[PDB]
Structure 1
């Protein structure tokens, strides 16, 4: 399958991340894309191409315009306000607060943020756009007829909601990809999030959209980031009622249990009538990944790819999370091998 990758991902190179009450070098670093890229190439998937230029038409259909406008000038405004560090939100519009939008940079950054550990830095906008382009090109290959494609997105995006960034996500690549497929002719598309974390941003985007189905397997939000979304009770709302299926799971969850969830989600995706499936691929479910509590092994990733590919519809794999462990690329490549069959 073709691999879409942009070098401009390196423009996203934040210096800080709030973790454990300290500012440390971000875990979502440029080297992640490098090792994943090297591994997939070694696995044989060497047909790597750079993404083409794309406007904001597609993304404007899933993200709020105010939010996108905010991301584009966030850094300049922050720097212009005279702050020394990177752009990090501290005030948030939580329970029983006003719905009004602040006018200054200090207020807006919190208004448009769901997780403060994520800092905005120089190049973030440009990088997010290149990652969005990689997703769009991936979707076009699918529309063109390809059975599968791999968009090596970075930064990731399943935590970026309609009008907020967080979890190292600014633009929901998977959402944009899904939207692109619909613009190319599809009437029904599904997004399958296998990343350890709940794709709260993807769910938020399509919660009231009846033309897109969203299924996610993840650590129980009661004890895992993003903490405030991902519960089984959330099945959709209004025009999108019934199009969300969450599968929260506890600590030590082996592939034996994780696999049942995967099977059930594919069954719901089939009953929905998806013409294609966008897979938000995160390999942080790996037993050796320190940021998760699931127990998946390297071989299980081959099984994952095969199971999803057996849906019988075209697949677009979009890179999401995964700690920078020596086996990150290996696991990603294992998923592509499973898909290739």
Structure 2
């Protein structure tokens, strides 16, 4: 299977992340892509190609235009305003606020942000576009008839909602890929989000859409980021009724339990009639992940990939989270081995 990867991920190399009340070096740093790429090559996945560049045609169908315009100039405006650190939102449009959009950079960065633990830095927009492009080229391979491909996206995407960035994410790569598959002729697509964290951005994008089914397995939002979406009761609205399936799970969850949710999610995807599945793959479900509380082991990732591929429909695997140790690479490679075996 082909691996799509852009060296332009390195353009996002932020200096800071607000974590535990301190500004620390970010968990979502360029070494992650290095570790993952090396491991997938070691596992025999050496058909690695750069994505073609893409404009905004596909992404404008999943993200708000004002939001994308904001991201394109946010750094420049922040710097022009004279601030000394990276661009970090402080005020947010929370309960019982005006719906109006501010005009200045401080107001707008809050308007367009869901979490202050993500700084915008120089090169962020360009990096996000490259990561989007990897997702689009992966989707194009599936649309053209391949049964599997891996888009090594960085920065990740699944916390970026219609008009918000946060959780280390700016453009929702998986959502763009699903949209691309629809644009290339599919009528029904599923996104299966196996990252430890709820894909609240993805959920937001497709919540009222019946052409995409979204399933997520994740740490319970009562005790895990993103905190404000991901409950089991959220099943969709309007035309999207019945097309969100959330599987929140608790501390210490091992594969024997997590895999039962996976089985159920795949039943619901099959009942929906997905023509392909975009897998939002985070390996922060690993037992040594520094910010997460599930207990998957490295061999479990092989099982996971095999189970998802036994759906019998084409898969695009899109990289999300997984932190701290180079075994993030082994874990990703193991999912691919399960898909390919």
TM-score by length of 2: 1.00
- The gaps in structure 1 that reach 5 residues or longer are none
Q: Deviations over 1:63-104 (max 9, x none)?
A: 000000000000000000000000000000000000000010
Shift in Å at residue 312 of structure 1?
0.3
Q: Deviations over 1:231-270 (max 9, x none)?
A: 0000000110110000000001110110000000000000
Q: Distance in 1 between matches of 2:172 and 2:50?
A: 19
- Classify the secondary structure of the residue corresponding to 1:270: helix
- The gaps in structure 2 that reach 5 residues or longer are none
1:134 paired residue number: 134
Is residue 32–residue 326 contact of structure 2 (8 Å, CA) maintained in 1?
no
2:111 paired residue number: 111
Q: Deviations over 1:132-187 (max 9, x none)?
A: 00000000000110010000000000000000000000000000000000000000
- Classify the secondary structure of the residue corresponding to 1:299: helix
Shift in Å at residue 290 of structure 1?
1.7
Q: Distance in 2 between matches of 1:19 and 1:100?
A: 29
Matches within 5 A, 1:83-162: 83-162=83-162
Q: Distance in 1 between matches of 2:20 and 2:291?
A: 13
Q: Distance in 2 between matches of 1:175 and 1:301?
A: 23
Is residue 290–residue 324 contact of structure 2 (8 Å, CA) maintained in 1?
no
Runs of 4+ in 1 over 2 A off after TM superposition: none
- Say which is worse superposed, 302-311 or 286-295, in terms of deviation: 286-295
Shift in Å at residue 326 of structure 1?
2.6
- Classify the secondary structure of the residue corresponding to 2:109: helix
CA RMSD of aligned residues (A): 0.4
Shift in Å at residue 324 of structure 1?
2.5
Q: Distance in 2 between matches of 1:122 and 1:287?
A: 33
- Classify the secondary structure of the residue corresponding to 2:298: coil
Shift in Å at residue 36 of structure 1?
0.1
Q: Distance in 2 between matches of 1:152 and 1:131?
A: 8
Q: Distance in 2 between matches of 1:17 and 1:185?
A: 40
Q: Deviations over 1:277-331 (max 9, x none)?
A: 0000000000011211111000000000000000000000000000131311000
1:222 paired residue number: 222
1:298 paired residue number: 298
Matches within 5 A, 1:1-341: 1-341=1-341
Q: Distance in 2 between matches of 1:324 and 1:133?
A: 26
- Classify the secondary structure of the residue corresponding to 1:192: strand
TM-score by length of 1: 1.00
